[PDB]
Amino acid sequence: GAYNEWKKALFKPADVILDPKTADPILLVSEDQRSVERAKEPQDLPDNPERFNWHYCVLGCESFISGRHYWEVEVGDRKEWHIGVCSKNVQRKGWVKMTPENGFWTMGLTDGNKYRTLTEPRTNLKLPKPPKKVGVFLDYETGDISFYNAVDGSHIHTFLDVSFSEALYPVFRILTLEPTALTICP
Numbered sequence: 638g639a640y641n642e643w644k645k646a647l648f649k650p651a652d653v654i655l656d657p658k659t660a661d662p663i664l665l666v667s668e669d670q671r672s673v674e675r676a677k678e679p680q681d682l683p684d685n686p687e688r689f690n691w692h693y694c695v696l697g698c699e700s701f702i703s704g705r706h707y708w709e710v711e712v713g714d715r716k717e718w719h720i721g722v723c724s725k726n727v728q729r730k731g732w733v734k735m736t737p738e739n740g741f742w743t744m745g746l747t748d749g750n751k752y753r754t755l756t757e758p759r760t761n762l763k764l765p766k767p768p769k770k771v772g773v774f775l776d777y778e779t780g781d782i783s784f785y786n787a788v789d790g791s792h793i794h795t796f797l798d799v800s801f802s803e804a805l806y807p808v809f810r811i812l813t814l815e816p817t818a819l820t821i822c823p
């Protein structure tokens with residue numbers, strides 16, 4: 638459809654790989670650096686400054702300061718996940734709420750069927766079908782972050798007219814221990 642035919646004409650396809658140095662020690666980054674899973678217990682890793690030590694988050698290796706970009710994430714049959722972008726300057730040590738005011742622009746799924754935007758307050762999304770693959774789209778200049786069902790091209794959510802100042806990283810978060818991973822499409 639139009640989604641497939643037009644996406645690269647309008648947005649530059651980002652080749653996003655996960656940065657193991659940023660991943661919470663309870664997270665496992667795959668060898669090919671496209672997939673993330675959760676461990677039963679935290680691994681023994683350094684608390685280097687780049688690492689999220691409280692939030693179960695991991696970042697992409699590269700950030701954006703301009704232009705239009707997109708990447709796709711296979712969420713599959715996961716019951717829980719949150720993806721989007723965050724500012725380079727987010728608090729990585731300890732806890733703050735993942736909201737736009739704290740530099741996080743994400744949406745996702747909890748409890749198998751509760752789709753929401755991580756905002757203050759959180760807003761519930763009504764999706765006609767559960768997405769298996771999600772397209773994340775960034776237009777830095779217009780300040781739009783948009784999410785689409787990457788299979789049927791249907792709209793999921795758009796953060797509108799954000800005045801971005803900082804560089805933006807792709808961000809990924811998983812809380813649950815389940816057999817299906819969260820995977821970036823190349």
Ligand SMILES: C/C(=C\CCP(=O)(O)OP(=O)(O)O)CO
Binds near residue numbers: 734755759
């Ligand atoms: C406290 C907990 C789940 C709630 C996570 P949270 O309070 O940051 O809520 P969220 O950021 O998913 O809207 C147990 O992992």
